[PDB]
Amino acid sequence: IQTGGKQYRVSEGDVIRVESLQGEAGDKVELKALFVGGEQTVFGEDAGKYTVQAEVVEHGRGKKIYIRKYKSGVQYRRRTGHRQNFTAIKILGI
Amino acid sequence: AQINVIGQNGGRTIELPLPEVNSGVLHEVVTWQLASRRRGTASTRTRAQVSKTGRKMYGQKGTGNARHGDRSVPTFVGGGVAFGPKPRSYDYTLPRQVRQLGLAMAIASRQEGGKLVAVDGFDIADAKTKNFISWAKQNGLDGTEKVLLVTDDENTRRAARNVSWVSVLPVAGVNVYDILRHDRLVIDAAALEIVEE
Amino acid sequence: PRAKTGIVRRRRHKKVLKRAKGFWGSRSKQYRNAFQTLLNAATYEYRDRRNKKRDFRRLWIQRINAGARLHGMNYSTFINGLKRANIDLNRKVLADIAAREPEAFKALVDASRNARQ
Amino acid sequence: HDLKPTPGSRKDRKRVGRGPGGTDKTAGRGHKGQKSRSGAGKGAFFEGGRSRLIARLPKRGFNNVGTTYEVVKLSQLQDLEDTTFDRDTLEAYRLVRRKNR
Amino acid sequence: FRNKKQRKQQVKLRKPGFAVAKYVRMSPRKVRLVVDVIRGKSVQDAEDLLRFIPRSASEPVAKVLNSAKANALHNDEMLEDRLFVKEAYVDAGPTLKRLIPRARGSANIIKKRTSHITIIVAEKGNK
RNA sequence: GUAGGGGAGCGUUCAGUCCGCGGAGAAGCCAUACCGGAAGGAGUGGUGGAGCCGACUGAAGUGCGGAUGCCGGCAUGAGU
RNA sequence: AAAGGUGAAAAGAACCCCGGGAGGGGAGUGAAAGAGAACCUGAAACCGUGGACUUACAAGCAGUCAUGGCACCUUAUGCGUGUUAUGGCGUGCCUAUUGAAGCAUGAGCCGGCGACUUAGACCUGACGUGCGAGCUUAAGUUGAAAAACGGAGGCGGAGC
Ligand SMILES: [Mg+2]
Ligand SMILES: [Mg+2]
Ligand SMILES: [Mg+2]
């Protein structure tokens, strides 16, 4: 989201911005802002009681993009590469 | 700090360049050596002048689309090579002391590995060549190394024509290039190898 | 020595001429026009990266006030409720709830109505 | 057998600061080098003058230069260097070479 | 398979029901008009349409079609009442460039375009 | 960030050195979704049919979209 | 002016088939004819045939971002690759200029050719190295699968 989840997900291995806890099963606990676990809907701080459990699957570089910039009649042309670093996390929590 | 091979066993002499050799100074040397050897032949009719072509064309205005003088400019296919190569030098005078420091420093490199001082090829007998290979075999000269022979014996030289081995160098007319170019230095004839200044 | 262009230009040219895919007419076939098109494409590329971010939030907001109005409210009011119920800090996700979970969306409308009036 | 870098003729290094690369006129497209008008592919507007201060300044002067002497300082003889002796050939050999004057 | 070197000695390349009229002194677009009516038609219809199309490209085209027929039968064993124009196309040969004089001194170039008329016969077979 | 100044580098030919590769397929050409922060670089396959990559160092006729630029080929107007 | 290239060797394709011919298809030679005499490679512009997805209520610097549909699976199955509908956004490039989409300049397209160099015992500065209160050779001479010699002279060294 803004980094570090929330919500009633399931057992999904999603991709988020780098977490620092290097290598497999580095274990991550999430704050939680809403949930539909057992159809029961609860939001903010009342959801804060509950938490999500994640397992750091992998560390990777997101598909290469190219940062291109151009200004006319000023002879301004720019070319630079980019790859965004992520941390893949397996969800398996409350 | 170096011994001998055939004829005696002294050697020991010479205050060889400090510290553990400088590549930068050898670099300065080789460059100069190759710069001097470089022939200055530069095949180019650079000038709009030098190429074979007339002088007026297809009038200044109203021909509709052009503005040209004559068929000899560098913008023309077949014209001059404006800024092309012309015969020149690249030979310069590398300071004396740096040339002296050069080969001394280069010899030092051969001391830190495989150096070789000899007194006469009485171990040769005629030119024969087959017999130079025999002598070389006795002193670890198998052919796995490129070798430089610096002898004044006109016959021991004559027994140097072979492959991945030797380049034969006369009357202490040595080179920082030649010694670095080969793996081992058979410094041999101890004429320049001892006594100067 | 002489050092003619040979191979360098054609390679330089093929690179550009391959970025030119579903480029109409000359824009995909002739170098100068293919290349020229790309300068302008660069403007669109760098701009549309930060633009999609306005584009989506727009779509997000539209879906919110649609559902907010389904339960006699509106985006302006609803959001203030969730803001006034400091506890509620969905912001991101909030549009999907309206669109997929109507049961859940209603709960958040009802909470928003409290924190307000 | 394996791949080897090896030291010698190929291990000879530049020297760091020894010699940098020249100026080839295209560091980006936006190089239409020199000025932007009146700085032209011509053979010099010149660099001196003939009013730009030099003229408009005075003198008839008169130049001469008859005889100029070699300065043999006292500190050279004194302080250090024990009397090897002056004469003519010895002062030269020690350090005061010049001729003609 | 083996490698290229081998393949070249192993499988030697055939052109079944193919014939080409090369360097035909006629403009491609002009010739294409005729060839366009003959594509997909049964070799017999092709032979007949050609005898009645009033364009001068008809003759050369017809000549290729008969050669493609012959080739299909003789060199390829194929059976005739099964034959049809699988493919036909006109490619451009080298242009004969000639200089025409014009008013007030100027000259122009006439392009005398040539054609490579190739037609490919195949056996139809519904099944 | 324009003129401009300063820094680090990519690529081409030639050269000296070293490591190699090649008719069980070299250069060049062609395709590609891979790599590098960019100039760029590699893998695989296809063609080709006899030469060539990599690393360090050296030297340049070393990088093109423009010049009513030059040479050449081919389009448009037009089946007019 | 421009124009080079079969193959190792002419073994330069007897004979057959369509055609007046040109041209082709076979057979044979050869490693290859994916070398056939418009003979090495054979880019690109340009002209075609075939297939995929598409288009006959549409307003357009021709892309770009987003989503849906169809197709495909050899760095390539969550990853895309191709293509396509609709939405948003969007004033070619260069030059010249206070001010360019400009109805201001240039340009039909592609390929190749095509512009900051070289010289001087020159001047002045940065870096670098060698000797260092000193540093250095020029013409030449002798050896040259190579460099050594040569101190005439030049610069520090006192200024007014
Ligand atoms: Mg010429
Ligand atoms: Mg042009
Ligand atoms: Mg004007």
E23 touches strand G (CB under 7 A): yes
**C 35-94 residues with CB below 8 A of A?**
39-43, 45-46, 85-90, 92-93
> Please, which chains are in contact with E (at least 3 CB pairs closer than 8 A)?
none
Nucleotide nearest to E8 (CA to C1'): G32
- Of A63, A58, A44, which Cα lies nearest the Cα of A15? A58
* Distance in angstroms: CA E24, C1' G86: 50
Quickly count: other Cβ atoms within 10 Å of residue A19's Cβ. Answer: 17
Instruction: Inspect the interface and report whether the beta carbons of C46 and A69 lie closer than 8 Å.
Output: yes
- Buried b / exposed e along B64-84 (16+ C-beta atoms within 10 A): eeeeeeebbeeeeeebbbeee
- Of B129, B133, B189, B139, which Cα lies nearest the Cα of B159? B129
Instruction: Inspect the interface and report whether the beta carbons of B24 and D18 lie closer than 8 Å.
Output: yes
B139 touches strand G (CB under 7 A): no
- Contact yes or no for E122/E43 (Cβ under 8 A): no
Please list every residue in chain B whose beta carbon sits closer than 8 Å to the beta carbon of residue D9. 30, 177, 180-181
- Rounded CA-CA distance C40/A71 in Å is 9
Nucleotide nearest to B43 (CA to C1'): F61
End-to-end CA distance of chain D: 72
Beta strands, E only, chain C:
none
Distance (Å) from CA C35 to ligand 2 centroid: 14
- Report all structural domains of chain E as residue ranges with CATH numbers, in order of start: 1-127 (3.90.470.10)
- Rounded CA-CA distance C97/C93 in Å is 7
Name the residue with the least CA to C1' distance from nucleotide G135.
B95
Domains contained in chain C, number: 1
Distances from the Cα of B70 to the Cα of A78, B57, B58, B64, D42, angstroms: 41, 6, 9, 17, 20
Q: How many CA atoms lie within 13 A of C21 on its CB side?
A: 2
Q: How long, in residues, is chain E?
A: 127
Beta bridge partners of A85: A61
D20 touches strand F (CB under 7 A): yes
- Rounded CA-CA distance E108/C37 in Å is 36
- Rounded CA-CA distance A91/C90 in Å is 20
- Between CA E11 and CA E17, with CA E13 as vertex, the angle to 5 degrees is 140
Q: Which amino acid is at E22?
A: K
**Chains B and D make contact, 3+ CB pairs within 8 Å:** yes
- Of A83, A29, A28, A88, which Cα lies nearest the Cα of A58? A88
Structure tokens at B146: 């490129």
- Of B40, B37, B34, which Cα lies nearest the Cα of B177? B34
Quickly count: other Cβ atoms within 10 Å of residue E125's Cβ. Answer: 7
- Rounded CA-CA distance B143/B128 in Å is 18
- Of A32, A9, A90, A93, which Cα lies nearest the Cα of C96? A9
Which of the nucleotides in strand G have any atom less than 7 Å away from a protein CB atom? Answer: 1-2, 16-19, 21-27, 30-34, 38, 43-50, 61-66, 79-80, 82-84, 87-90, 92-97, 100-101, 107, 109-120, 127-131, 133-138, 143-153, 155-158
D99 touches strand G (CB under 7 A): yes
Distance (Å) from CA B51 to ligand 1 centroid: 7
φ and ψ at E14, to 5 degrees? -115, 155
Residue C11: which domain range? 1-117
Please list every residue in chain A whose beta carbon sits closer than 8 Å to the beta carbon of residue D30. 74-76
Structure tokens at B67: 């503005």
- Contact yes or no for E85/E120 (Cβ under 8 A): yes
Sign of CA dihedral A28, A33, A36, A40: positive
- Kindly identify which residue of chain C lies nearest to residue A37, measuring between CA atoms: C104
Looking at residue C37, what DSSP letter applies? H
Indicate the domain borders of chain A: 1-94
Beta bridge partners of B166: B147
* Distance in angstroms: CA A72, C1' G102: 14
- Rounded CA-CA distance A3/E19 in Å is 69
Quickly count: other Cβ atoms within 10 Å of residue D58's Cβ. Answer: 5
- Rounded CA-CA distance E19/E63 in Å is 10
Distances from the Cα of C84 to the Cα of C60, C80, C81, E69, E107, angstroms: 20, 6, 5, 89, 88
**Taking phi first (over 0 means left), then psi (-120 to 50 degrees means alpha), and beta for anything else, what does residue E104 get?**
left
Residue E5's Cβ-count burial label (10 Å; 0-12, 13-18, 19+) is exposed
Distance (Å) from CA B76 to ligand 2 centroid: 14
- Rounded CA-CA distance B189/B157 in Å is 11
Q: How many CA atoms lie within 13 A of D45 on its CB side?
A: 4
Looking at residue B99, what DSSP letter applies? H
Please list, in sequence order, all residues whose beta carbon lies within 8 angstroms of the beta carbon of residue B132, skipping any fewer than 6 positions away: B121, B124, B156, B159, B160, B162
- Rounded CA-CA distance B16/B2 in Å is 11
Task: Report the relative pairing of strands B147-149 and B184-186 from DSSP bridges.
Answer: parallel
C18 touches strand G (CB under 7 A): no
Specify the 3-state DSSP secondary structure of B110: helix
Place of tokens 């007419």: C25
- Contact yes or no for C68/C103 (Cβ under 8 A): no
Residue B91's Cβ-count burial label (10 Å; 0-12, 13-18, 19+) is exposed
Q: Minimum-distance ligand to the CA of C32?
A: 2
- Rounded CA-CA distance B127/B162 in Å is 13
- Of C117, C67, C85, B40, which Cα lies nearest the Cα of A34? C85
- Rounded CA-CA distance E54/E33 in Å is 11
Residue A4's Cβ-count burial label (10 Å; 0-12, 13-18, 19+) is middle
Q: Strand G and chain C: which residues 19-48 have CB closer than 7 Å? A: 21-33, 36-37, 39-41, 43-45, 47-48
φ and ψ at B33, to 5 degrees? -65, -40
Distances from the Cα of C47 to the Cα of A70, B116, B194, C52, angstroms: 11, 72, 77, 9
End-to-end CA distance of chain B: 20
* Distance in angstroms: CA C40, C1' G98: 26
Which of the nucleotides in strand F have any atom less than 7 Å away from a protein CB atom? Answer: 1-4, 6-9, 11-20, 23-25, 28-41, 47-49, 55-71, 74-75, 79
Distances from the Cα of C48 to the Cα of A24, B16, C42, C59, angstroms: 36, 69, 10, 16
Please list every residue in chain B whose beta carbon sits closer than 8 Å to the beta carbon of residue D12. 23, 26-27, 30, 180
Structure tokens at B57: 């064309």
- Contact yes or no for E119/E87 (Cβ under 8 A): yes
- Rounded CA-CA distance E68/E75 in Å is 10
- Rounded CA-CA distance C27/C37 in Å is 7
- Rounded CA-CA distance A34/B109 in Å is 75
Specify the 3-state DSSP secondary structure of A3: coil
Structure tokens at A49: 């009681």
Please list every residue in chain A whose beta carbon sits closer than 8 Å to the beta carbon of residue C104. 34, 36, 41
Please list every residue in chain A whose beta carbon sits closer than 8 Å to the beta carbon of residue D28. 75, 77
Name the residue with the least CA to C1' distance from nucleotide F28.
C7
